[PDB]
Structures are given as C-alpha cells and as structure tokens.
Design a binder for these strands. Sequence first.
DNA 1: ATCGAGAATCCCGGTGCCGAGGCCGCTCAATTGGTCGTAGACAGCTCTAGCACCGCTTAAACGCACGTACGCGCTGTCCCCCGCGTTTTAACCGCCAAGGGGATTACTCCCTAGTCTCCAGGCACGTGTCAGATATATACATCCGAT
DNA 2: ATCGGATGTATATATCTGACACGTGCCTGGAGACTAGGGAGTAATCCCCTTGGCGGTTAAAACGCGGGGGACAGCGCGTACGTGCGTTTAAGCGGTGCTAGAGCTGTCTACGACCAATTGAGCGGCCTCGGCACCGGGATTCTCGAT
Lengths: 85, 148, 99, 99, 76, 108, 109, 82, 83, 94, 93
Amino acid sequence: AIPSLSECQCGICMEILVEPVTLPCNHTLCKPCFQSTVEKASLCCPFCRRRVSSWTRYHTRRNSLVNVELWTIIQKHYPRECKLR
Amino acid sequence: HMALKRINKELSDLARDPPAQISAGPVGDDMFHWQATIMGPNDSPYQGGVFFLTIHFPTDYPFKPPKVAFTTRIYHPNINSNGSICLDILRSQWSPALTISKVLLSIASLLDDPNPDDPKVPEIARIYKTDRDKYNRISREWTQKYAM
Amino acid sequence: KPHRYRPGTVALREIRRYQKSTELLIRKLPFQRLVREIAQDFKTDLRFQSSAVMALQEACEAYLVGLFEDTNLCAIHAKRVTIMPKDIQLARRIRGERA
Amino acid sequence: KPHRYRPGTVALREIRRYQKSTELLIRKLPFQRLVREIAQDFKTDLRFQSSAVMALQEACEAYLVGLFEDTNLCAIHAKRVTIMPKDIQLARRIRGERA
Amino acid sequence: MQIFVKTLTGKTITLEVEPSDTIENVKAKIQDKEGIPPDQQRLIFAGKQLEDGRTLSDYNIQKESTLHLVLRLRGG
Amino acid sequence: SAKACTRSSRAGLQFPVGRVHRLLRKGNYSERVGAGAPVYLAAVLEYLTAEILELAGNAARDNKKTRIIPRHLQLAIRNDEELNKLLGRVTIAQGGVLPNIQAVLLPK
Amino acid sequence: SAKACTRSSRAGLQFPVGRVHRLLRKGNYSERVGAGAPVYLAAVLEYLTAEILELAGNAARDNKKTRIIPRHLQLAIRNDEELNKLLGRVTIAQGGVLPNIQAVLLPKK
Amino acid sequence: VLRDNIQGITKPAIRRLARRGGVKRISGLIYEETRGVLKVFLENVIRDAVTYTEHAKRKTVTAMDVVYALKRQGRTLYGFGG
Amino acid sequence: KVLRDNIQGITKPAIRRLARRGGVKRISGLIYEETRGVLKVFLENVIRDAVTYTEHAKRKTVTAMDVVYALKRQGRTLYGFGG
Amino acid sequence: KRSRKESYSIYVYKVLKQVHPDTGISSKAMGIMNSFVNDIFERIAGEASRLAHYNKRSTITSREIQTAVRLLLPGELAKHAVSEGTKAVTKYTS
Amino acid sequence: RSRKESYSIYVYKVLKQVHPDTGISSKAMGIMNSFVNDIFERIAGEASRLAHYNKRSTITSREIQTAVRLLLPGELAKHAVSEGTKAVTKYTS
DNA sequence: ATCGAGAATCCCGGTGCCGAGGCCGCTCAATTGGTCGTAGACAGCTCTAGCACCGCTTAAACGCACGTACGCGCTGTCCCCCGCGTTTTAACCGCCAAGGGGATTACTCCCTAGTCTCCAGGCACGTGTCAGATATATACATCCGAT
DNA sequence: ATCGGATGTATATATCTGACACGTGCCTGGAGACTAGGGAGTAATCCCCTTGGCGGTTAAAACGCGGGGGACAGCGCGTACGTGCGTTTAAGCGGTGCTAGAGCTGTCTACGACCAATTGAGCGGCCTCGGCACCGGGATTCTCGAT
Ligand SMILES: [Zn+2]
Ligand SMILES: [Zn+2]
C-alpha cells in the first residue's frame, strides 16, 4: 500500500518531508526540522522522548541521515508538491 | 514564513475544535501577540473565577516555548504576584510536538490541582500543605474579591 | 580409548572463558606479601590500606594483559605462534619502556 | 673492465654519512606548498611565518626518522633486512598511534 | 497624615495613617485598600527601607512624604 | 532567562552550576572567572555523562540485566571509536577486555 | 647570611631569585608562595644547566671546536643515561642522531 | 623480613594472564621475564607511592596515593576515587 | 588558487635519505606510499591544533609559537624555536 | 563527626533516569562515573587556563572553554559538545 | 619596542664558570632557554598539584623538594636536592 | 565428502540474601542585593615582513639497463609444551583481640601580601673582529677481481 | 691469502666574512621598611581499621608421562632492488615592489570581585524489598576417532 499525502507531511511544520531522518524510535520528520532541533532544541525525539545523540553521531560520520527511499517514493508520487518550494 | 503559517493553522485548529472552560484569540493585528481567558474549575475553590492571560510568541514556534503571563492578579500556590508561572512543561518538558491547545489544557489542569513538589512561593506552599480548610476559603476570598 | 583433546583445542576454550569474565587472576595474599616486601625495601615500617593493594593489583593485571597482547602480535608477525622472550623485549623497546 | 661496488656497500656508506649530517633532508618548497595546501583545506586565507614552516619540517623529519628506526628494528627481528609496509603498521600499532 | 506609595507596576495609591501607627498597621491598611500582601512589601523612605516592627514616627515621615515600593518575589 | 531562579534550571541543565563556578574560581586556574564559562563546562560534562550512561544502559539491557556494572561501562567505552580514542590511557577497574582472537590462531 | 648583597648573591647563586619569585607568584600556581621555594628552585635549575653545559662543552672539545652547536647538545643529551631518560620525549633542532648500525647489517668476514 | 617471594607469582597465574591476553602457545622462558618486568613495574609505582605518602607526614599508604602515582606515570585509574 | 596532488613533492630520494639516516640498508618498493600517508596524517593532526590556536587569538598569520605549543600538546615537544 | 564529602552522585543518577527510566546503577559504576567526570573537568579547566594565560588575559570566558573543548575532544564529540555549550549559554542569556 | 625577558646572560655566566674558553651560539641559546622554561614549568606545576592535594594553600620549599624527587631520576634527584638544601641553608644564615 | 559417543556449554526453575533506593533530620554554602576598582573592546596609527614576480645557475630527480642476492616456498628432523591423572600445599573464609595512627578540635603565633618609595641590572642598539666554512692540493684506508 | 688498481675518505694551508662578544643609555622592574590577620604549627582526644593469630576445607598448585604438532635448519629459485649513467626538471639564490596585517596607544564602559543575611539543595544515617547470586536438572552444541 501507499500512504496518502495527508499522512506523509512532517509532524512539526505541516510540510512534505524533505529528505527525512529515520530515527531508531521509528519517527520520521523533515531534515530542516531535525537540524533545527539538534542545533537548539532538547536533542530528543519530540514524540516518545528518547535521545538519539550517539546514533546521530554514527550516521553523521557516514552521511546516512537521509533516507533515499522516502525521497524517491515521494518525488515519483508527488513532483509538484516538492517542486513548489 | 513557517512560524506565521504554523500560528494560522493552530488558530484554525482551536477554532474548529474549541477547548473546554477556556477561550483565546489574537488581541491585535499582529499574529504574534495573543490573549486568552479561563474560567475557574467547579471542583476547586476557584468558584466564580474568570482570569485574563496574555501569551507572547517568539520568532519561532513551536520551535521555542512561548511566554505566558497572567494579566489578572490571581492567587495560586505556585504563581507569583506579578504573574510569573513555574511550569515544567513551559521550560523543561517543552517539545515542538506540543501545541497551544496542549499547553492551555495543561495549565488548566495545573490550576485544577497544583503540584507542590517544586513550590514557587514556599510560604503559601506550606500554608496549603498544613491544612486544607484555611487555604481553601482564603483562595475563595481572593477569587471572589478579585475575579468578581 | 580414553578421550584426549587435540593439543591446542582447549587453550582456545580457556581464552574464551577468561576473555568473558573479569575476576582477579593473581592470588591476593602472595601479591600483597610481595608488595609489602618491596615497600619495606623502600621504607621500613609501612602499613597498607586494602584499597591501595587492590588498586595496585588492578594496575598490574592491566599492564601485563597489554604487554602479552603486544607480545602475541609480535610473535604472529614473526610467522610463529609461540611467544618468546625476544618478542617481549621487542615490544617493550618499541613502546619506549626500555629504549 | 668498469669498477662497480658490490650491492650493499654504498648503502652502508650512505648510512654512515647521513647519520653525521644535520640539515633538512626534504626540499623546502615542496614541503611548504604541501603545508599550505593542508592549511587552506582546513581554513581559507592564512599566511605562514617562515619559522612555523621550519619547525613543522623539523618535527616531521624527527618523527619519520624515529618511525623508520623502529621499522628497521622490527625488520631485523623478523629475520630480514628489508622493511615492508606490514612492518610500518606493526610499528604504528605497537606504538599506539592507531590502536 | 497622608503618604505617597509608588510601586514597580506604575500604580499610585493613597493611604490614611498616623505617625504613631506601626509599619505593620500601614501594610495591613494597604492590604485592606488594595489587596497588597503585608508580608511581601519593601517600602523605602529617604533611601532606607521601613522595618515592620517600628512605627512611622520613628522614621519621621510627615505629610506629602513619598514611599518607594519594590515588589518582592520569593522563589523561582 | 527569567531572573530570580536557581542557576541549574535556568538553562535546562542537570549538572550543578554553583559548584562548577566555585571549583573554577577556587581551583587556581585563573584570577577571574567569567559568567558563561561554568554554564558551558557544565553543559559539556552533562552531555558526555549522558552519552556514556546511554551506551552503558543499552549494553546492560542487551546483556539481560537491569543494572549497570563496570563491565557494561568498559564495553560501552571500548566499543565506540570516539570514546575509545578519548579514553585511551585510562584503565577501568574490573572491566576486563574486549573478546577477540587473531584469525591465524583459529584452528583449520 | 649577613643580608647585605643582592638576593641571588646572598645565596651564592647565578640564577635570579626575584625573577623566579615573580614567575611563581604571577603564574597562577597557588595563592601563597613561600620565601624559600624560589631559592631552592633556582638552585635546581642552575645545577641542571651546569651539568648539561659541562657535558656539551666536553663533547665540543672532543670534537675540536670552541663553540657549542646544537649537534653538541644532542650528543651530550643522548650519550648520557639519566639525561636521556629525562629528555626522552623532546626533539632538538639540528640535532641529528647518534650513529649506530645493527650488528646483523655489517658484512660478513 | 621477606625473601624469595617473587616465586609467589606462579606459573598458572602467568598462564591465565596470557590466556586472557589472547595467546595460544607459551614458551618455557616467558615466566622469568614476566616476573622481572612485573618487579620493575612494582618498584617504579611504589617509589612514587611512598614519596606521596611520606610527603604528607603519614605512615599508611592509601589508595589515593596509588591512584595519584598512576595518574602521574600516565596510567590513570578509575574506580578508587580521584 | 587551489592545489592538487602536491603530496608527490616528497620525492623518492627524500624518503630514501630519511631511511638511510634512520639506519636502514635495503628498502622495499612499497614503503613510499605508506610513508606519504603517514606524513599526511601527521600534518593534518598537527595543523588542526595549530590553526585552532592561531584562530582563537583573532589572528590571520599562524606563528611558530602556535606550532610549538601544538606539538607540545601532542606530546612531541620541540626546542630551539621559542617557548 | 565525619566531615561532609561532596560528589557528583545525585546529578549522574538524575541524568541516567532522564536517559533510561528503568535502569539502576551500582555503587562501583557511580564511583567510576564520578572519577570520569572529575578527570574530564580537570583536563578542560587546565587546558582553558593555559590557553587564557597564552594571550595575556585573566578571565576564563566561554571562548576559552569552547576552544579547549574543540582541542581535547575528537571530531564528532567536539562538534556536539560545542553545539550543546552554545545552546546552554544562549538559553541562559535569555 | 618591547622587552622580552630571557635567561641568556645567566646561562652564559654559568658556561663561563664551567668552561673558561668555550663559546655558545644563538641556536644553543634558544635551546637552553627552552629547556630551562620547560623544567621550571614542570617543577612549578608538580609543586602546585602537591600543594592542592594536601588541602594546603602555599608552596613551601619542601613541596618543591618533593617535586624534584618525583621528577628527576634517582642520582640526578639526589644531587639536585643536596644542592638545593645547601643553597637554602646558606641563604637562611 | 559423513555417523556417533563423550564431553563442555546454555536455559530454565526454584530459593535465599544484602545492598540500592527512598525517607528524615539537619548544617552550610549558594542566592540576592549592593558597591566599586579595573580589563579589555574599540578606534587609530605605524611599519614589518609575507607575498608575488623576475631571471640565472646547476644540483637533484628521473628513466633505463644490468646484475645478483635474498624472500619465499618446500622438505625434513627432533624435541618440548600440552593434556591428563595423582598427590601435596597453602588460599580463603570465619573468628577473635589489641592498639596505632588517621582524623578532628581548639589555641596561638608569625609569614607574607599589600602599600609606598627609590634606584640599578638587564635590555635594545651599535660596533669591532676572528672561527670556521670554503677552496685547493696531498696522504692513506678500504674494496674488488685473482691468483 | 695478498697482490695492484681505484675509489672515497682523511689531512695540511690560505682567506675572508658575517655572526658573536663587548661597550653604552636608560627605565621599568627589583629591593627595602611597616602592618594585619589569616594559614599553619602544636597539644589533646577519639575510635576506625590494621595488624596479628587459630582452625577448617578444598580449590588450586606441583609433579610425572605419553606424544604430536610446531620451531628450526638446509636447498632451490627468480624476481625485485641495488648500482651506474645520460637526461630533463625545478629547487635555490639575488633583487625589487607592495600592502595586509601585527603590534603599540588612548578612552571608558560594563563585566566581575567582595561582604551580610538567608534559607533550601544536598549530605549523613536507617530500613526495607526485589534483583541478583547460587544450585540442580535438562536441552543444546562443538569435538574427534572411524569410517
Ligand atoms: Zn518539518
Ligand atoms: Zn521518538
């Protein structure tokens, strides 16, 4: 099955996901929101409140924050929504 | 930008889903500054208590916690005279997932039953913890003399 | 007829067992007696708190384990399996403890 | 008819010679250019005092000399007279620079 | 005998008291007229705070005298 | 931050701020100590301790235990490259060593 | 002592007592500095400097030179034993290295 | 008085330490060299420990002295204070 | 004004002379690449601290003193250049 | 009686509870964490003091601590530590 | 310009006292200055740490003596402590 | 390529213990307020040398050819740790008992930081001169092919 | 076992030059006198814990024997590296031009040191209950001699 556009939008800024980060707590949100949170927020996942600092370091070293499957699926389904930015 | 659209969506959500015992709105043309009113819960010594409060919104939300203040000088075991509010949601457990409806309902719940584990004003905290009756009817006398 | 293990197949078992647990390996009283001997060689009429003796034993075990690790690595480098005193001397000289 | 030394004597002569000399064995300009390249990789638009470049070169030469000394000693330990890369990383591992 | 009280909130109030009246009585009357708690007031006259135990006559406060009130918040 | 509140919770920390300020002032490090230095140092200490404790707790939960022992701390410290490099010359008491056997030594 | 001459000359030293005292006081080492510590430290520093200078001068004389060059200092430091242990991590500019070759390298008779 | 106590560190103890280290086959002359190097290491640490415990005009060598000596030597130890 | 493949400036005879000073008779054919890698790593390690030191002081020219103290911090103290 | 001793026990326990709400910690682990915290504090403070003494200053501001953190810690740890310090200082200011 | 303190003349005097004829070059001057600074810094830091460990607040002569005994190897330490004791004894009277 | 007997290791269930976590009382240091001497941030000026360019030598790097010597694989020998069984020894636990020194408290006393004043020791600058690097030409130690 | 080339290394002598040792102005830092008071030396007391000893039991250490796998020595090879020579490349040195930036100086304003009062965060002591240590039984899995 395919999730709808209403569900896939970022849970923080109500926007379409922008190369999101897949957290170990199985939470997905757009990369600008994640960078803002790690830069100046509590450095914890907003939903279930579990810090991801070590995993963040491990994936930042390898540049694996982006989840390319979500990018490909969202751009093949909805080019216009991504292109309007 | 993102903040303005977020505030607009929050306003639309609270309008289409009004909360309980409270109401809120934009005081002026500027979307950042906000006003609200709350009614004293019936299962409390706050009978006949209407309270006006103001909300100041920073340049980003819900990225940063908004500022809350009580325009009406109302007695409370964990609230100062000038309106200073000691809420662990406000400055410690604040998260971007939290919305304005969530924080208003949380503060309403705190007014329903205050938490004395981390008192703001120790003297009235120990007044409350000593016995119920004097605290109850003294809170009643302020909430009648001030709110009404 | 009696079951005898091949030479070298139980040393691996000992390696696996000792690399998993973290107890002390040198008997406490002989080490304490040796430490007291060295101390009275340095200064006479000394008394040792048990915590100091335990700390010294911990440090000695750590140092010896590291030295044997380096010695094993050198012996493997030498296309051998046995560790010999020349390996220990080489490891100590490279680490700068003897120069 | 032409006279040529046996393979090995010239190397020993160079070892006996260079161990007395004290100047820099690396050409100044290539080292300066490499240092500037690394610096501009780290941060842009810096200028280097000549004394800083000289100190960097001296430190690098001393470090490389020590590394080659240890590598050759390991080669002699391994029943050989030729240093190979495996000797280099064995020396680095023992010295603890990479663990 | 009347005094001027100015607080940090910009509200000016008037109180009817006497020099023989204690500072505690002054604060009680302030609470009666405005609801300001007697135990959380810092009133300053001539650059010095007025202690609750003694009276106004000890501080030599006459007509038209102005008292500077600084609201005191406890805890945080 | 709002005035008139405890320094530790002003910036959302859990490590003490007054104690760190006193330690910097009385520790013979410098004649004068700035206002933001204790906050910065306390934040750094809290972050490092939180990381170490998170890794140790994860290892302990992996090891079917609900309490952290020095072995879990040793595993957490020596398993991550950055932490191992930072704590390179430090020996943890009763921590053991990481299990490894050289490939040549394995039987054929 | 009679307490008549300068502090350095009073103790019979050449290294400064006042400069060492100022460095100790202004160096942010401790709140208070004793009145005997600078003298003792100056004595230790002077003795170490004298030893190294004597060794370097002897090495230079054995090399038929009247001046101490960094090579002489490196020879003096490396050749001795206690100084080599003390300065086993330092690097001397223009120092070279002690000349030696492993016995295996030398050609067979 | 104690003498010839270096034999307290017996052959099985050295074998167990080597097995923990990760070695499979042990020669016959390792034990003497190991005893010598261990004696050297103990002498070096105990010298600084005794200096520390003597500078304070005390007479009992406590764990703080040992950890301070280890930290000075470059072998910082965790578990006994500091 | 970027620079490319400048690590080749450490030519083969230079490494050979360094080895001869170190006391090595016979040299293999693959030592040179490992030597270049080691030199690059050491330069990065020292230069990082040197640049940080010269950047904290709001300066633009790294001085020899910064290099000296970076080396001292790394444990390889240097004499004869100040400090 | 016995003199009062001050340590980093309760703060470490609070941090652990904030990280893992269902994990206890033994006494030896508490001692190890206390020693680690003290050692890291000493390292950072000493490096910052030396660096402040370099530029002929007498104040240890946030800049010296930031630079000392950048120097002592490895790459990723230093980056996240400097981010955390900047965040904490910014939140303390306002 | 600005003054820059150094131990140049003092080490030169010591050299003249030891060797009446030998000279010393500028590079050797810098090397000796760096060595003196390093040794002084090491001893001062160790003395400060010793003073702080024993809940003290002053750096007396005995703490410097203990630092010297800790730092230098055996024979050098004995010679240095003897020389310093002689110096302080001569100075105090 | 495999089957099976004997041995080592992991799971599971039950029982018992001691130390980790929470609570209570309390003493002391962190907080708040106010004051005051000064650290360095900033704007301004000077002037050093780091950068860039040009041209002329010639020393070092390079590619190629040749030869040889040693790194490596193979084979054989022997001998010495290893695994196991039996016997001797002291490690570890528990128990008791004394007293020596670490730790605390109170008292006193003198060492030193601070202030001011005064003056001379070493530093920046300049100059004369000879120690050693350089060039040139002899004397000898050593290596290599071959009897 | 050397003998004669032949190479490189070692040794004696002029020379000249630039870096080292010394003279000098001076000024900023070092030396001398007086006070206060807090840090440190010293006497007295308490009780923690450290040394010392006796008995048990038993896990660990010591000793001996068969043997099989690994350390070590010898041989052969061919390929990679030492050595020499002609050639192309850029390091090294001199000379000059320029300005970005290092370094020194004057203002003063705001960040930070010091002292009292005070009270709540944090520490010493107690108590308990559950997570962990331990034992017994059974299921699971490497291992090796024999096919
Ligand atoms: Zn978003
Ligand atoms: Zn989550």
